[PDB]
Design a protein around this ligand. Structure first.
Ligand code: CU1
Length: 140
């Protein structure tokens, strides 16, 4: 019934936590915190989606160069952050080291498995394992 607060921390090259479960209709406040530990710290991205878009050159790859999600989880989802309210097209949280960002939303009716990932560094963060699984359940 109330606002559920989640925090996702970013490190080189992983999210804590790397798994999260929400219910359709849940009120979520989410903090994304770039805790990049390197010297210097590196920028990290948080984007939730489905259908990995990768580069192609006609030549096969043990690892696909990730560029982003085709389907964005936040497509059409009203977001509130500071004094701003409404949907954000192509919503993504990109942060330098030491920056964080908090926003809230109601979990849209998009049940099933979504992924979160970082595509900075031409997909290198992703390819080094910077991704997580979001499971969306129907409302209780
Ligand atoms: Cu990253």
């Amino acid at each position: 019934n109330g606002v559920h607060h989640y925090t996702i921390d970013e490190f080189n090259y992983y999210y804590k936590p790397d798994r999260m479960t929400w219910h359709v209709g849940e009120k979520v406040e989410l903090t994304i915190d770039n805790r990049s530990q390197s010297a210097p710290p590196i920028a990290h991205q948080f984007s939730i989606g489905r259908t990995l878009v990768s580069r192609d050159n006609g030549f096969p790859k043990s690892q696909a160069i990730a560029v982003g999600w085709k389907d964005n989880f936040f497509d059409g989802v009203p977001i509130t952050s500071g004094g701003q309210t409404g949907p954000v097209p192509a919503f993504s949280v990109s942060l330098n080291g030491g920056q964080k960002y908090t926003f809230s939303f109601v979990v849209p009716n998009k049940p099933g498995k979504w992924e979160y990932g970082c595509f900075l560094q031409t997909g290198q963060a992703f390819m080094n394992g910077m991704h997580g699984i979001l499971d969306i359940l129907p409302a209780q």
